[PDB]
Design a binder for these strands. Sequence first.
RNA 1: UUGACAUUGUGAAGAGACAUAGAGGGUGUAGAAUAAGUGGGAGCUUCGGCGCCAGUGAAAUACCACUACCUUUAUAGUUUCUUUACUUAUUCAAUGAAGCGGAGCUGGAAUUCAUUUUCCACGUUCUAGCAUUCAAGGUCCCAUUCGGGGCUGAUCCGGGUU
RNA 2: UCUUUGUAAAGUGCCUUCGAAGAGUCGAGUUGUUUGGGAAUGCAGCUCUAAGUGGGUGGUAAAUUCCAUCUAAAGCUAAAU
RNA 3: UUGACCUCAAAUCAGGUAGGAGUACCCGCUGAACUUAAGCAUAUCAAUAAGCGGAGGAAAAGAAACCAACCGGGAUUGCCUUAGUAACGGCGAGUGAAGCGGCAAAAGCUCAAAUUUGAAAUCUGGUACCUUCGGUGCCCGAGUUGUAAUUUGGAGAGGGCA
Lengths: 203, 204, 174
Amino acid sequence: GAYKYLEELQRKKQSDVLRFLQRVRVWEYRQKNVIHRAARPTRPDKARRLGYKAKQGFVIYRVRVRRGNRKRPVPKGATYGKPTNQGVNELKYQRSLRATAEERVGRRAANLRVLNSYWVNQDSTYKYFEVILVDPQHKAIRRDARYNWICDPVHKHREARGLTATGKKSRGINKGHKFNNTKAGRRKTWKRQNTLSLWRYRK
Amino acid sequence: VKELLKYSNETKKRNFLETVELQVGLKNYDPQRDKRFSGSLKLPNCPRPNMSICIFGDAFDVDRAKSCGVDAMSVDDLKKLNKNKKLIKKLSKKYNAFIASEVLIKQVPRLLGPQLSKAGKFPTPVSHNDDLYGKVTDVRSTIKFQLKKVLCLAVAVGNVEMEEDVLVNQILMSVNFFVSLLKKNWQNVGSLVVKSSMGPAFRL
Amino acid sequence: DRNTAAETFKLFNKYRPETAAEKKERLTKEAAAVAEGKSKQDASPKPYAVKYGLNHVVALIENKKAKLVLIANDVDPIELVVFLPALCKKMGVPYAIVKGKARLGTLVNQKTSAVAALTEVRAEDEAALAKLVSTIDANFADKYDEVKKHWGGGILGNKAQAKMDKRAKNSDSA
RNA sequence: UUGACAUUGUGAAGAGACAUAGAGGGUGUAGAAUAAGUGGGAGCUUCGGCGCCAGUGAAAUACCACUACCUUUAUAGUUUCUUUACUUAUUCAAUGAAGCGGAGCUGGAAUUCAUUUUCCACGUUCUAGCAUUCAAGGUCCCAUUCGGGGCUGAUCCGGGUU
RNA sequence: UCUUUGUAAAGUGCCUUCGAAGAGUCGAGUUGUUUGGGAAUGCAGCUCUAAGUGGGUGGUAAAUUCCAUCUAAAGCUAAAU
RNA sequence: UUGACCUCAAAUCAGGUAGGAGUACCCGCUGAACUUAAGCAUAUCAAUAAGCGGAGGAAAAGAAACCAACCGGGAUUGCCUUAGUAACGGCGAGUGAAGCGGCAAAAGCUCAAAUUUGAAAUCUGGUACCUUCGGUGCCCGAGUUGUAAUUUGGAGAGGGCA
């Protein structure tokens, strides 16, 4: 096929062709709404390898998230406590911007379920993503057992509980000795070792 | 590969129109420094002769001025001193020994210049005169490193067939590469502009 | 231009893929044939339809089997199609950039097609095929390095262009 | 508040050097002779001529070359400085995005050095009135019904609201 | 117990050509945070930005040379809890 | 002038679907301070409480970009243990894991990237019928900017042979 060729074009992002296309598209999205419908992917190579089958029910949205640091609330900087916890400007917000994009399109189109998302663009002020939401009640998705797992109601809002490719990243989940804050989730492995486990016949 | 071009071979034999002994010259290319202890300071045996004319001013002493009447070019002594300092220049390179190291301070102003004497680099004051004379009348190369980067030497003759001249350019590549200092760069064989004396230049 | 595209779409009006009714007809014919003569899909004649589909056409160009390739001047994900002139130049297959992917859709009975490819041709129009190949290679494939070195774009709007013309006329000449 | 990077691209000046070869430049003694150094080397061209040799100096040549040394960039881009010239990014502002840009017409300033080389205008000023019915007129149609359509009246071109 | 669904499907031996395998990602600098993780455990901002006998990891940084074990940047899955 | 394509829409269009409550457990974000240090600023309380978002009968994790260095082991979870150790820390107060060993349970896999190209063979919907949680036929649509079959790193694909 030709997705190998689109893949290798999409890897070289600062050559003159892709920086031209990136500037046309960054204007093209900076003149539309914040969350708006994408009739077709702009990266079919990247979209298809995340789970896009171009048939009915798979919808593509495109989304601008603002770009920077989470300036803390609790107004006028007066954080009312120890001077340890007194930062306002340099706090940096454990969720990715890729998670805020998916979560906002999941709050808009709520009958749908989110599969993944991919980068398309970034300027200085914004990041631009496309989200690859699936419509689960549509009968093409409910059949064909590769894609009915989104129908099971334990997968409502994969994007909110951290279940996509990036939610499973931002939660720190892998195997490894380097992942011991969380390998099986952080809070379960917190409570599993601040439990004082007792027994009937006290050892 | 050195087989598509000539580089020592039969391909450049009719390019030069002089029907005299015209010799091939190989230039090694690698950036070096300006100091004098760096580079490839070695002149090995060239296996096939360069086919050059050379006469030796053997100014020898008691134990060594007897093996020059069999296989040599000229027989000299240490008494003939008032010639090689003023007028005569009929020589190509000399050959001396270690037995007389006090006559070397006399023939400096005339013979050290055009490479007719020895300073420190070429095996000219070698003592053995019964076996090293089958190696110097079969004329060797000349490995002499210059100021910034060039290495001009002589391998063989272009009119010589490619049977004798097949292990001569190959043994010479293994001298300016392995005994060399660690002050050279990567790809010590980077460029080899090889032209003999008259024709075009054939490079690797 | 209009003339070479006119000849090309005459040639492609001669070569269209099989529609549903013709498929039903050949299904009835081979359903008779397999039940009676037991010809393993060999009582049907050999097709000569146009090749189309982007992975299809790219694989046919890679395997050196494409005679001619039409390319659209289109879809804004142009990463789909900017590597087709370089493939057709690298693999020697002639290539033409026809205007509008909708005519490519109408000759293939789709909405759009975005590529078109001849690999087979019947013996009626070998000469017309060679003439079209000659015309397109005069237009595209021989002119590859020239257009490869030049930068398009930079055309101004006509207001600022006319202002630049007035200024460059009145600052250099009289 | 200031500096650096990103959004942030593109033309026009000024110094560093490369793709790419060439004309030429580079004068302490001696030595036919301005040898920045090296290699091959006793000969080449029909001849002449030079060259080997000779002699000289730290360096011997005719002949073909490499590194270099000072200009010349003719062809294409990379850099920091000049702020200049940019609209498409960006930012502001206004309007129920109404006349913007370019060209022509009639007048007229305008003097012609051949014929226009240019530039301005290009429907309203005593008056607390009025200004609307796709516009009257002119012109071409319908198939003459009572009516309706087209162009002009109100210049074309470009679709960038300014 | 009624169909025999099928000249269909699956499975394994030998030789040859092969053998595609996820990029603003991996990673690195710095900052905030967290960890038991200590020249930096993980996440996140911004800046730079890859590779293919490549890439991660082998918990004192770095250079050089081997070895070992793995395949990321896509997705499903009851029970023990 | 007719007829398509892309893109964006408008309906009390046809049919769907999400909001809320509970929230004991579970998944994430956000996030303190009293308190301990015999003061207090890092630290500790605590990666906690309050707030928020989202699920289920369990959630999550899950078939290794793992642990190891052995004679190697093999998805995940949980228990006994390693271990109050290694390490961190005004090296103060305190904070604090992992690998192996034993056991319960044990279950494995699926996509993208290969033209099927002698044949989109696939699918939503509407219709008519029925052995009407669905099946068949027909008909517009999605769809080749790619829907089916074939394979997924453990293998596998294309030819050839028995």
